[PDB]
Amino acid sequence: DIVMTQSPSSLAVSAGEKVTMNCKSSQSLLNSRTRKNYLAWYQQKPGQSPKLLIYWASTRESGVPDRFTGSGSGTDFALTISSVQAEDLAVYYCKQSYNLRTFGGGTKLEIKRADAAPTVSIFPPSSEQLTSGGASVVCFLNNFYPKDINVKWKIDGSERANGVLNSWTDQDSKDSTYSMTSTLTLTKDEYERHNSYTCEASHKTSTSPIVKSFNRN
Amino acid sequence: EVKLVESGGGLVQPGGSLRLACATSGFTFTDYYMSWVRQPPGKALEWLGFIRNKAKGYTTEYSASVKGRFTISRDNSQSSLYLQMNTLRAEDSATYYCARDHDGYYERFAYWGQGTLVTVSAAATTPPSVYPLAPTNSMVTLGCLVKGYFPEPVTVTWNSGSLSTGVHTFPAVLSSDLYTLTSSVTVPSKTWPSETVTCNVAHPASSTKVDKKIVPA
Numbered sequence A: 001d002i003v004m005t006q007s008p009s010s011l012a013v014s015a016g017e018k019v020t021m022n023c024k025s026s027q028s029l030l031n032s033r034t035r036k037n038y039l040a041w042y043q044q045k046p047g048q049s050p051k052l053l054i055y056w057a058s059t060r061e062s063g064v065p066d067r068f069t070g071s072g073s074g075t076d077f078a079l080t081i082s083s084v085q086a087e088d089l090a091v092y093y094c095k096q097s098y099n100l101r102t103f104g105g106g107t108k109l110e111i112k113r114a115d116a117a118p119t120v121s122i123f124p125p126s127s128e129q130l131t132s133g134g135a136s137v138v139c140f141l142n143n144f145y146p147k148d149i150n151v152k153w154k155i156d157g158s159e160r161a162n163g164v165l166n167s168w169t170d171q172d173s174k175d176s177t178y179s180m181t182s183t184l185t186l187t188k189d190e191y192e193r194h195n196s197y198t199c200e201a202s203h204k205t206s207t208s209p210i211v212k213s214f215n216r217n
Numbered sequence B: 001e002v003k004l005v006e007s008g009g010g011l012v013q014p015g016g017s018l019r020l021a022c023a024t025s026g027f028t029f030t031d032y033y034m035s036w037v038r039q040p041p042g043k044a045l046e047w048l049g050f051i052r053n054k055a056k057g058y059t060t061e062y063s064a065s066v067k068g069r070f071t072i073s074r075d076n077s078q079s080s081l082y083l084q085m086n087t088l089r090a091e092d093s094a095t096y097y098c099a100r101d102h103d104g105y106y107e108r109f110a111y112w113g114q115g116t117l118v119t120v121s122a123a124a125t126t127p128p129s130v131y132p133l134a135p136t137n138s139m140v141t142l143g144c145l146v147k148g149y150f151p152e153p154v155t156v157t158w159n160s161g162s163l164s165t166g167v168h169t170f171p172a173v174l175s176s177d178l179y180t181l182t183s184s185v186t187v188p189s190k191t192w193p194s195e196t197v198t199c200n201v202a203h204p205a206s207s208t209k210v211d212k213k214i215v216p217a
């Protein structure tokens, strides 16, 4: 029976920097007949299917950039990325095939980039939703770094924090940013009792919040 | 050219059964083992079983976690693979992948399909409501709010795919058994609203196709 641990669970590296992730087997995956290690690496990009990178531990698959090197033997294996590109954002899986197949838990690779401020957009409920009796107010915080970020919703100057759901995107594969959406949901009636709607974005890129507002006007 | 396509995914009640299919093309089917792999959202891949090729007489192997509960079979006249799933539970909820496996030489899952998502829930299929997000700068940002559907997934495009860059689709969040997500699109303020912008949203669970034009407020 074969147990695959992977290490680390996650890390972030800057473009150009080097990257090593590890793969432990509970037993040797060396087939003495073929003298090969039955160990493969898969890259799985956000939203995408797993793609093959390396098989037999060391063998790189066609199309795969040379910056990707698979190493090791026995019970210890490693995927090295020599000069990381933004496109390299993904979870990497090792998998043995010496005794059926077993995947490791994965190494999630994030990219480090310079801090960048969010572009913030606010949107009032559509009249379609309203006539149906609901009021969702939505706020986009796009293309910022780093991920950590706080949103404040304020109605007529007072912070409401119920009815608010937040959602972050995977990191962007090109520009290495993150975007976040924040939706405050109210009944139409409650929405109609108030005048000013404000999305307040607090990010380390500025001591001052980014402030987008609309009036039910 | 090699193709693998999974189908059959969607909502099944707990205790229920479901069979998935995997249609293939562009390679010699009977030469290959074929594998099924799953992945609970935000989680690791898990190999579940294969059925060997023609050389080994199309025998099946299973991971201990589904051995006895899941069944694999292939139709060699059609280049098609199946996974029969019984007595489903919540932890069976996951994207399911067919993958081309062993052929006699290489130890690699050379190709994978797009995957099909299976949700095991007593909750009921609910079609989404789709709302326009309409709003100064040189770029302008629009959105569509896809609210209250079940189960996952939905797809969002902008102008039937012809608007691909500057698009952020946010991961759905769950609440009272309804998912909610948004997609933002950023275009030159030059172009809107002089040029129509429309989101195209699909929810296969409910055969829902929605087009929504973003019209100025």
Ligand SMILES: C=CCO[C@@]1(C(=O)O)O[C@H]([C@H](O)CO)[C@H](O)[C@H](O)[C@@H]1O
Pocket (backbone or CB within 6 Å): A031, A097, A098, A099, A100, B052, B056, B102, B107
């Ligand atoms: C004679 C071939 C055996 O192949 C299989 C098989 O079919 O069972 O067994 C191989 C083992 O190395 C044999 O000791 C591999 O795991 C291979 O991928 C496959 O699972």
Ligand SMILES: [Zn+2]
Pocket (backbone or CB within 6 Å): B059, B060, B061
């Ligand atoms: Zn057997």
